[PDB]
Every structure is written in structure tokens, then in C-alpha cells.
Nucleic acid binder design. Structure first.
Ligand SMILES: [Mg+2]
Ligand SMILES: [Mg+2]
Ligand SMILES: [Mg+2]
Length: 121
RNA sequence: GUGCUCGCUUCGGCAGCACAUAUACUAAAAUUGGAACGAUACAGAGAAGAUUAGCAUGGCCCCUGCGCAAGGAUGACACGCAAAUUCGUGAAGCGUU
């Protein structure tokens, strides 16, 4: 179940962070260029220095577009059958009756049987 | 401007001294814009059938009123394809390591 906005974030982060692959060439290049400060503390100096080249920002933009697509596929539309006896006259009435069947559907299980058998019992 | 000068010294002038010491949104204007109902056509008053009392609520909406009264159509407006972070099952067919 859902239970939190942070647990779905954590699941989504584990997915993205397992999908990524690091490049050791760029890593060792920047390590050899930066030297002493490549293992920084909270307070070293480099906060206002990095300028990423075009390939890095292109990779970030493509990854973020894929992430936006994965987010937009979150609520899949359930298929609409017209064989069920419809009990709504609007477009919002159908979804409100669906919410009523979600919440009160466990309790109001005898009266629907009474209705379908002819208002008896 | 006025007065006093044992001022020249006449009643003409001049000299000295004293008192008196800074108005005006500066126009009888040139300009510059936003504005008077109200007439012109249109336009028609909320609450799930119809006929209807209303009291609110919110603010780059005001009017009448001295009003922290009360009115203005319940003063008007508000009416919205009301979507905010973040997904997974199972088999089935096809291609692939
Ligand atoms: Mg009123
Ligand atoms: Mg009325
Ligand atoms: Mg009102």
C-alpha cells in the first residue's frame, strides 16, 4: 500500500539509482585534476565552481524526461464497459458512485441483493 | 518717505545721522490627460421541477449612508473538461542473450 509520499520516493530512487552506470574515465580524470579536494568535507571550498559540459546536461535532461514519462504513467485507466447497469447521469457522478462502491460497498451488500431479487427480504 | 542736525546755510540744492529691510502654490494663461447622465442596439436576475425570504463567506469590485446601523438582485463576482509528489500483477503472442 501507499502509506507515505516518502516510501514511493525511496522506491523510485532505488529504481533510478540501480539503473545508472558510472563512467570511470571521467571519474579518474576529474580525480586526477582535482587532487586533494576530490574527497571534500561539508565545508571545503568547491561550492560555486563546477561547470558541467553539454554531454552531462544532455544525459540529465534525457533521464529526467524518462522520469517524467514514468510519473505520467502512474494512474492507468481501467477499461470502460457499458454492459453494467449504469446508475449515473453525469461524468462526475460515475466516479462518485465508484467511490461509494469503494467505501460503503462492504456494508451495503444485503440491500443490493434485496433490490435485485425484487425489493424483498 | 519723515524727522533731527547750534551742516554747509539758504529757505533752492547737497551732506551726515536716525527710524523704516525681501510679497507672490509667482497667470488676466498656454498646455496636458481623464471624465455627464444618459440615450444607442444587445442584455435578464441565486439555491439540483416551478414560485420564492434571506444571513453570510473571499478580495487589484464598488455605490448610498455620519455610521463598527442598514440597504444596494441574498449588491455584483464566485459555476471550475475541479488530476499535486509516486506504482505494480498474471498469463498470452512475437523477437532477442
Ligand atoms: Mg445586505
Ligand atoms: Mg430575492
Ligand atoms: Mg452579500
Amino acid at each position: 500500500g501507499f502509506s507515505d509520499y516518502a516510501a514511493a520516493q525511496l522506491r523510485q530512487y532505488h529504481r533510478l539509482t540501480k539503473q545508472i552506470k558510472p563512467d570511470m574515465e571521467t571519474y579518474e580524470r576529474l580525480r586526477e585534476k582535482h587532487g586533494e579536494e576530490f574527497f571534500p568535507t561539508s565545508n571545503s571550498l568547491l561550492h560555486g565552481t563546477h561547470v558541467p559540459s553539454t554531454e552531462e546536461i544532455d544525459r540529465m535532461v534525457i533521464d529526467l524526461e524518462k522520469q517524467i514519462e514514468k510519473r505520467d504513467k502512474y494512474s492507468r485507466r481501467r477499461p470502460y464497459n457499458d454492459d453494467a447497469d449504469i446508475d449515473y447521469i453525469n461524468e462526475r457522478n460515475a466516479k462518485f458512485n465508484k467511490k461509494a462502491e469503494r467505501f460503503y460497498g462492504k456494508y451495503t451488500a444485503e440491500i443490493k441483493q434485496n433490490l435485485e431479487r425484487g425489493t424483498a427480504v
